[PDB]
Design a protein around this ligand. Sequence first.
Ligand code: QW8
Length: 411
Amino acid sequence: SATEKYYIRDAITKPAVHHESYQKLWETKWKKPCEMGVYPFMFGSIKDFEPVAQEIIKKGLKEPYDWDEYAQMYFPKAEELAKIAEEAEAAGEKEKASEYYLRSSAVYRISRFPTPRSEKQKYAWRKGCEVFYKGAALMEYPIKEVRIPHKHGIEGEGDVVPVNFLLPPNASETSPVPCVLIITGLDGYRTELAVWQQGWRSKGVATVIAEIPGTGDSPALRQDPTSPDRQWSSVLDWIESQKAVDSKKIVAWGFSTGGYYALRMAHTHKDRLLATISLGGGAHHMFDREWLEHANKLEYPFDLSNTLAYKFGYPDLESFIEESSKFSLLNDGTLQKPCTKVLLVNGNDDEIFPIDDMFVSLENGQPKLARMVKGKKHMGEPESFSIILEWIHKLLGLDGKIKEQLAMIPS
Ligand SMILES: Oc1cc(O)c2c(O)cc(O)cc2c1
């Protein structure tokens, strides 16, 4: 059956305990990364989240979640942190203001995980973005929003591609810098992957952070497989206009679902990218009935397959599965085209997207760079981040000081 189909075999039939309740999500999956200040709790503090978790656990919330009831639990804490930030900014305490705005943005973020599917989650997205950019503007090296005109947009698409932008100091047309284009995931948007930007700045590298179609503020048509292609044309046209960036040194790094888009654009925009990295991406079997019919109950904190269906613009999973084959980079002929430099990295035991899709990626077109991480699930952490930074440092001729860069990630 499905138990024989994929690399992980009958692991797909074992429901993960975190789906039983929020209590199990918190105790077995979220408390630890929150304490360490890492994804999905970048910029966050256990001091903020633990009191909120305790209130959710007392209420006994669990799948199926009422996303308005769920989101509202985070709001009193998010507002408290935003009020503290405002009073700090009024007093000229810039470093403190920045911290509490970003702590507020983290609480709003988790309130609209896994993706905004209710009015209060849609509200939390807007409120989280607002406090993130207030925090970002008060960083020593401010990260700014750029509303890139979507010149390549068609009917029914948004007029702009909102991105984060950070340019290292002394970057100029005379001394231009490489750019890491970060493509975000199904749940982590530009307000989350922002955590990478100061690291890249410290190594003399510009960053642009953009969301995938049907997430954050992406203007792209959800159901149209070619919508990302138009988005990257607008984004890369804008990066080329920034003369302080070397347009011959753009590296696209796709995180999780972002990996699919990084792999896709290595083909669609080969001549405009030095390299792309897919970290925990998929390509083909991520759209399989069998995979999607099992993934709701596996390592993903909530309902992966339903969330992916919503991101692709479908009202339910069955309707998505009916048409999902058309998004395959194999089915649509993408993987037959020439590609720029591609690095594929993932944990073998991934239960969000199958390692089988790294195999499909290596079974078609030109040879690609790969590191498989045995005995690890989605993203193959922490070794994956060291592998990728080492490769990008070598590619761009940076200082190779990847431990220094990685140490800047934990909040
Ligand atoms: O350690 C990480 C860091 C991330 O940025 C992740 C992300 O964006 C998506 C995901 O599914 C897992 C992640 C794990």
